[PDB]
Write a protein that binds this ligand. Structure first.
Ligand SMILES: O=C1CN(S(=O)(=O)c2ccc3cc(Cl)ccc3c2)CCN1CC1CCN(c2ccncc2)CC1
Ligand SMILES: [Ca+2]
Lengths: 51, 235
């Protein structure tokens, strides 16, 4: 709980909903198994500088 | 872009340029998706017919990864007001979908609450464009990127000479010679977080270019987020 400690340990969007913290991701990602990190699902994710 | 750095391969893939019939770039823009480019509303006045250009970083050579798209429909915010520059924002619908490749990738849209809290409280923000490097100089030929620190909502209002409404924020340097400038309007103002950038501002207006005691006013994207949604289905 508390998306204020360090963004709730989320890689992106974080929601203090009720008690515990809830993470989520931009459009194009998917929340990882741990429920925090955001994994790309396509070749050119938004927000990421091309390589 | 007064001062600032230079975008390197892949550094600013969400940039987009609005070119006129004379094929000169007159404004900037951000890539949201394969079909939509974000931009400053007042930019739709300095050129009868125009097209959006992406994947370009040197307007005079050919990195080969450029692309000129045509506009199917231009969505302007109904409440725009030239006289005041309020509700200055528009979205463009591309006829031909954007093909994401190196130096060509969309920029993520934040979640309003999460944004204004975590994003808009970061120390800095990335502004970029092919705009004037000096207040009275010519326009840029290379794609630039400055790092504008967030200004205090209040100092901002005091330094002004005009009213910074609900729909706009300040960013830049008091005295430091670093600001955006002519031709950078509409241009992207992204904020970095854990190696990922989010759209948080549309190069709107400013008094001069990097003037002492003067700041840079961008369009508060976080506010028009619900708008940008139903606008990406045209409305
Ligand atoms: O001083 C200038 C500079 N240019 S700019 O160089 O191309 C230019 C263009 C975009 C920029 C964007 C940023 Cl973030 C910073 C500097 C910029 C510089 C734009 C126009 N003006 C003057 C006008 C400025 C806005 N204004 C109002 C009116 C009512 N209510 C509010 C504001 C009246 C006079
Ligand atoms: Ca080029």
């Amino acid at each position: 709980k508390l998306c204020s400690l360090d963004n709730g340990d989320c890689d992106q969007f974080c929601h203090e909903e009720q008690n515990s913290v809830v993470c989520s991701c931009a459009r194009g990602y998917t929340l990882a198994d741990n429920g925090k990190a955001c994994i790309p699902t396509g070749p050119y994710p938004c927000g990421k500088q091309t390589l | 872009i007064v001062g600032g750095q230079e975008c390197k391969d892949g550094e600013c893939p969400w940039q987009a340029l609005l070119i006129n019939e004379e094929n000169e770039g007159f404004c900037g823009g951000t890539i949201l998706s394969e079909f939509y480019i974000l931009t400053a509303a007042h930019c739709l006045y300095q050129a009868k017919r125009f097209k959006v250009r992406v994947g370009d970083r040197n307007t005079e050579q050919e990195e080969g990864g450029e692309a000129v798209h045509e506009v199917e429909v231009v969505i302007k915010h109904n409440r725009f007001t030239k006289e005041t520059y309020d509700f200055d924002i528009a979205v463009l619908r591309l006829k031909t979908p954007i093909t994401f490749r190196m130096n060509v990738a969309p920029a993520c849209l934040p979640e309003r609450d999460w944004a204004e809290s975590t994003l808009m409280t970061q120390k800095t923000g990335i502004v970029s464009g092919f705009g004037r490097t000096h207040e009275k100089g010519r326009q840029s030929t290379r794609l630039k990127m400055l790092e504008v620190p967030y200004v205090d909502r209040n100092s901002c209002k005091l330094s002004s000479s005009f009213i910074i409404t609900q729909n706009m924020f300040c960013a830049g340097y008091d005295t430091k010679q670093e600001d955006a400038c002519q031709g950078d309007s509409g241009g992207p103002h992204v904020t970095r977080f854990k190696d990922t950038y989010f759209v948080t501002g549309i190069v709107s207006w400013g008094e001069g270019c990097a003037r002492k005691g003067k700041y840079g006013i961008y369009t508060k994207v976080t506010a028009f987020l619900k708008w940008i949604d139903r606008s990406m289905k045209t409305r």
